[PDB]
């Protein structure tokens, strides 16, 4: 807006293309820890084996579990 800066020094090669307090690999490590939280929660859910404590038997539909209505051989 105000006054675009007109260069007075030689431009670098990568000037067409040119997050402040944390480092690069440190940020990668923090984010990896954050995702390892999700991994640990998934492993905990595996260890929980909630599927083995379901409090009802599986549903059973009539007419041979709706075989014909689901596209089976009539």
């Amino acid at each position: 807006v105000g006054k675009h800066i007109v260069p007075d020094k030689p431009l670098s090669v990568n000037d067409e293309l040119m997050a402040d307090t944390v480092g690069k690999y440190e940020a990668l490590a923090w984010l990896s820890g954050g995702l390892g939280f999700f991994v640990g929660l998934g492993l905990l859910a595996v260890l929980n084996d909630k599927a083995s404590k379901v409090p009802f038997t599986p549903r059973v539909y009539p007419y041979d579990n709706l075989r014909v209505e689901l596209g089976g051989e009539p």
Binding site: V1, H4, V6, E16
Partner: protein, 494 residues
């Protein structure tokens, strides 16, 4: 055998039109600038209307060649040459005839200094390129393709902007001539077997799997230079940037299509077994070209250099489509060839509009142009969207049909080719926003003019064609299906 066609409008008269224009212009004094301008423009427009008529009389049910007519070189009649089109070459004739008047119109303002030589060169180019697209003979395809080198050389060298045009013209001529000589070698090897160069006969002869391998390589050496395929693509940025605006339009919109036309017209049907054997090779080369060239495009700082690199990625997608060897693949390859010929030409025209006023190609000088040139900004945005294959535009049809064709053969090649959707968006939007968006920089540019009437009119048919192919590609695909189907089936009988 005289194969003279019944139709009144035929191919020979469409060949003769720009020739007669050039002869007439040879003799008119350079002082009569208005007469020269009008005569050239009218010859080109009449040729365009003639090609449109040729589209109406076209029969979209046959796999044969149409309007076939013959052309008799010696009284011995051993060597007699044929012209004819089909559903793969028709729209390329139309595109050539359409682009040439655009080229004459782009240089309308500077014609007082351009002279009649500019119009004569472009008319000669038109005659040679229409001939090339209309030839049913390998040897005349060769002769008419090499001939365009002379006027193209002159066009780049004389009316290019700066002294880099020297190197650009040298490289264009030498690369193209090397490829052409390779394909001459292939033509002679074929002739030694068959005793002929007539395309129709070669479509009905059987080549050994071994003889096919060698002949395919010798065709590939021309065509890959023409496409261009990596790593013989480096002549293209130099030549397409240093050329004048209309020269760039002809180079990108027509001349680039000759390699893919050669692949469609001679290599795939004449040597189907070699075509099968080389398919992984072609897939690899094209996928490497798309990724690497798109990423190079991302880091270019010159307007014309960005638009020129974009064409390498688009043509290698075309090659993937045509070597998929099915309806989606070949249909999409042809449609993308035509759409690219419109879109890249319009983009070169936009950059030329900017260069004629400001005389710089460096992106950093521009910026904030939306506030001084809103009409140019809107048109530039539209063609930027078309270059990203936005659905609704013509390029999306060909792009998606090619991805369909590739996926049915090899899912990996389709996956590598679909990465272009991400990279082309990136560079196209970055270019547009650095040129048009932001603030003005008055220390570089402070005086502006939006498009005049001539420039708006020039853009109108490109917009109409892009939208028309984008929303209703049936008009084109209906005239092509029989030819495409017979190309896909050639060499097999089940």
């Amino acid at each position: 055998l005289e194969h003279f066609c019944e139709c009144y409008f035929n191919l020979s008269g469409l060949i003769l039109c720009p020739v007669l224009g050039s002869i007439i212009l040879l003799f008119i004094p350079n002082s009569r600038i208005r007469l020269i301008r009008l005569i050239g423009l009218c010859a080109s427009l009449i040729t365009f209307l003639y090609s449109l008529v040729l589209w109406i009389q076209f029969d979209s049910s046959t796999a044969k060649f149409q309007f076939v007519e013959s052309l008799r070189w010696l009284p011995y009649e051993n060597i007699n040459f044929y012209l004819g089109i089909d559903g793969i070459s028709l729209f390329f004739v139309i595109l050539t005839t359409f682009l040439i008047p655009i080229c004459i119109l782009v240089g309308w303002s500077g014609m007082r200094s351009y002279g009649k030589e500019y119009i004569i060169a472009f008319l000669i180019c038109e005659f040679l390129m229409i001939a090339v697209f209309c030839m049913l003979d390998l040897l005349l395809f060769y002769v008419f393709f090499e001939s365009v080198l002379i006027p193209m050389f002159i066009i780049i060298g004389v009316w290019g902007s700066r002294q880099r045009k020297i190197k650009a013209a040298y490289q264009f001529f030498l690369y193209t001539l090397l490829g052409s000589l390779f394909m001459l070698l292939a033509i002679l090897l074929i002739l030694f077997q068959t005793g002929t160069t007539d395309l129709q006969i070669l479509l009905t002869t059987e080549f050994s799997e071994r003889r096919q391998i060698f002949l395919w390589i010798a065709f590939f050496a021309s065509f890959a230079v023409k496409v261009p395929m990596v790593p013989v693509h480096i002549w293209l940025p130099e030549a397409h940037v240093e050329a004048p605006t209309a020269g760039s339009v002809i180079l990108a919109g027509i001349l680039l299509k000759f390699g893919t036309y050669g692949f469609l017209r001679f290599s795939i049907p004449m040597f189907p077994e070699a075509t099968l054997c080389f398919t992984p090779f072609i897939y690899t080369l094209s996928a490497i070209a798309i990724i690497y060239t798109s990423l190079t495009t991302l880091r270019q700082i010159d307007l014309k250099k960005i638009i020129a690199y974009s064409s390498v990625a688009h043509m290698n997608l075309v090659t993937i489509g045509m070597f998929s060897l099915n309806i989606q693949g070949i249909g999409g390859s042809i449609l993308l060839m035509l759409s690219h010929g419109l879109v890249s030409s319009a983009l070169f025209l936009c950059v030329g509009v900017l260069y004629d006023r400001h005389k710089t190609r460096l992106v950093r000088y521009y910026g904030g142009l939306v506030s001084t040139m809103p009409n140019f900004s809107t048109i530039f945005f539209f063609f930027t969207l078309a270059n990203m294959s936005l659905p609704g535009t013509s390029s999306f049809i060909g792009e998606f049909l090619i991805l369909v064709g590739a996926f049915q053969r090899n899912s990996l090649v389709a996956t590598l080719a679909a990465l272009g959707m991400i990279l082309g968006a990136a560079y196209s939007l970055w270019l547009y926003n650095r040129v048009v968006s932001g603030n003005l920089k008055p220390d570089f540019l402070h005086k502006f003019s939006d498009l005049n009437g001539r420039e708006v009119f020039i853009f109108i048919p490109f917009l109409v064609g892009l939208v028309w192919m984008g929303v209703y590609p049936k008009v084109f695909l209906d005239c092509m299906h029989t030819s495409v189907s017979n190309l896909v089936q050639h060499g097999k009988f089940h």
